[PDB]
C-alpha positions as semicolon CSV with decimal commas, in nm:
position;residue;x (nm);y (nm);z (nm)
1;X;0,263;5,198;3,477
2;X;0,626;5,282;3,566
3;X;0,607;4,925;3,844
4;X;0,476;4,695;3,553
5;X;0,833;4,540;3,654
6;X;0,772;4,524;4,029
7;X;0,433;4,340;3,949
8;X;0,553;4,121;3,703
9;X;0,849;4,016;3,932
10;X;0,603;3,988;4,197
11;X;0,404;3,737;4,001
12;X;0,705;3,521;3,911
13;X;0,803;3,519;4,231
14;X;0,472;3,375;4,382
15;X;0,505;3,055;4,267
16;X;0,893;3,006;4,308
17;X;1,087;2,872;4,650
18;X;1,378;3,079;4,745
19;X;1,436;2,823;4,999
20;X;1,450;2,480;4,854
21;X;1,098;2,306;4,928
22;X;0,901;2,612;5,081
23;X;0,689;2,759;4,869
24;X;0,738;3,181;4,852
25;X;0,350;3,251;4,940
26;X;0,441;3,016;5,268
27;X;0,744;3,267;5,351
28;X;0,766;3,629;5,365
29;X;1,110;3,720;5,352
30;X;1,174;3,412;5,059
31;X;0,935;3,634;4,875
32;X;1,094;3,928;4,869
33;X;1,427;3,780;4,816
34;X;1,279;3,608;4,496
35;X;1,151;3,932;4,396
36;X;1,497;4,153;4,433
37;X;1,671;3,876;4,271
38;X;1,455;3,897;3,932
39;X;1,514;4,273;3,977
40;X;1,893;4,250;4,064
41;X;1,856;4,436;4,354
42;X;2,097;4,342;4,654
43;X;1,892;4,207;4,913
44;X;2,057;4,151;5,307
45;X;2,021;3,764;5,375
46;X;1,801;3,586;5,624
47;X;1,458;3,571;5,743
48;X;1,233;3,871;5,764
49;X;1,348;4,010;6,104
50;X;1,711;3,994;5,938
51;X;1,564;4,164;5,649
52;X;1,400;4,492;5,797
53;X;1,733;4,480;6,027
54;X;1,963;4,484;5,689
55;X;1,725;4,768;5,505
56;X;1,723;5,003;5,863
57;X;2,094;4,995;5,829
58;X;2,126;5,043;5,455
59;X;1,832;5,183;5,288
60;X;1,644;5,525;5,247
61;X;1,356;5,525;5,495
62;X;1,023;5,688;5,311
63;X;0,839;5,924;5,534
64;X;0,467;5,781;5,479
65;X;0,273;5,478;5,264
66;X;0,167;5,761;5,052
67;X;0,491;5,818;4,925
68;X;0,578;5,421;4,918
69;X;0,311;5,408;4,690
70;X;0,467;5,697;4,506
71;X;0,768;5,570;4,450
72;X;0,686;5,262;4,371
73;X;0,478;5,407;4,100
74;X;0,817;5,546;3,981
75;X;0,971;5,185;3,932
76;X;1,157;5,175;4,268
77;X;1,154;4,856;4,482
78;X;1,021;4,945;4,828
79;X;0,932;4,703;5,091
80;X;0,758;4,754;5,408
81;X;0,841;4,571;5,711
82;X;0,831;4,553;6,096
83;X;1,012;4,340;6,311
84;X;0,832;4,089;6,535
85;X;0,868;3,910;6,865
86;X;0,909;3,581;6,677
87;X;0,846;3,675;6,381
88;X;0,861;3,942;6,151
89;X;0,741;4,045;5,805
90;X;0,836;4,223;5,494
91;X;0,650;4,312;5,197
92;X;0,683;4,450;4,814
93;X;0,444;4,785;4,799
94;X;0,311;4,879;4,417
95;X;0,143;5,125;4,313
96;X;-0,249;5,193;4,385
97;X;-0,514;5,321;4,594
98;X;-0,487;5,376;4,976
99;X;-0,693;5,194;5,204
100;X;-0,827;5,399;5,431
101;X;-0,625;5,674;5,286
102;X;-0,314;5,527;5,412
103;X;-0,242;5,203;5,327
104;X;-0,063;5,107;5,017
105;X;-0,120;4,781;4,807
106;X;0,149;4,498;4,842
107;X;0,287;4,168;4,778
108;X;0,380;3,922;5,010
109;X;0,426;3,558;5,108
110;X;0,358;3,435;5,489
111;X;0,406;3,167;5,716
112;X;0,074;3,253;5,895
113;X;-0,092;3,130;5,607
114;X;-0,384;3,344;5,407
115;X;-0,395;3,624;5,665
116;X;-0,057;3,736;5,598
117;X;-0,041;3,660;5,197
118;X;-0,135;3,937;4,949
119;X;-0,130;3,911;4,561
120;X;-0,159;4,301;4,506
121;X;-0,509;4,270;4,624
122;X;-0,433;4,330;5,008
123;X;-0,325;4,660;5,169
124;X;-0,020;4,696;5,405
125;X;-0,306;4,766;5,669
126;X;-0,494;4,450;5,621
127;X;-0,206;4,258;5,630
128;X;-0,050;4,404;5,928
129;X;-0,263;4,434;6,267
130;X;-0,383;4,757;6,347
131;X;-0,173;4,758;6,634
132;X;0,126;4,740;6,370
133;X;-0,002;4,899;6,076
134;X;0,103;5,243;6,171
135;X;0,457;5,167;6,277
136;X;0,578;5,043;5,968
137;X;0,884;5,136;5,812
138;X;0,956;5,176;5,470
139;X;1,253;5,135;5,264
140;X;1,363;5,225;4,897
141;X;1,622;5,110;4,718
142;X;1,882;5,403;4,565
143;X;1,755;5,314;4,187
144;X;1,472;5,219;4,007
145;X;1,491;4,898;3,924
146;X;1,229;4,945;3,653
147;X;1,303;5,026;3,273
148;X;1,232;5,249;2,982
149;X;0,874;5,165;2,813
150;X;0,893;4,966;2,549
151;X;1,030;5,142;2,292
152;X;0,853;4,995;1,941
């Protein structure tokens, strides 16, 4: 679909180190960093707490996971995040089912190790505690960063 780019910039991004010598599945917010830089997307610097705290003050909040999904679907970047005590976490949302009929599918790296790492295969609300998984916010960028099929 319409986030083919999302996943495939997703996929590069797995195996790259935004920050020299830490691998992007070992670190959420290198992750999506990676990810918005293969899509040219400005991204706000710093770890994931500075992240969500650079999207609440500059990006379009979506009402629901349902429509994160949706847009995504579309060919817009949208990440999910929460900010943490310590730590905090983003994520890249694609397209899919729901889990539970809520959750949307994502990407992400983690410094908690497998629990918080997702290759498109974990929802939002498997990643994310239940105590967290309904206060999430999510943020789209003002384009989609996604092109044209190909056309021949």
């Amino acid at each position: 679909s319409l986030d083919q780019c999302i996943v495939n910039a997703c996929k590069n991004s797995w195996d790259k180190s935004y920050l020299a010598g830490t691998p992007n599945k070992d670190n959420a917010s290198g992750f999506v960093q990676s990810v918005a830089a293969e899509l040219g997307v400005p991204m706000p610097r710093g770890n994931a707490n500075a992240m969500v705290d650079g999207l609440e003050q500059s990006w379009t909040k979506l009402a629901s996971g349902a429509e994160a999904a949706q847009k995504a679907a579309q060919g817009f970047l949208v990440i999910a995040g929460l900010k943490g005590r310590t730590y905090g976490h983003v994520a890249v949302v694609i397209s899919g089912p729901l889990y539970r009929q809520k959750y949307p599918m994502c990407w992400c790296g983690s410094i908690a190790g497998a629990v918080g790492q997702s290759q498109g295969l974990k929802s939002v609300g498997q990643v994310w505690n239940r105590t967290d998984r309904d206060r999430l916010n999510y943020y789209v960028y003002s384009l989609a960063s996604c092109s044209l099929p190909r056309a021949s």
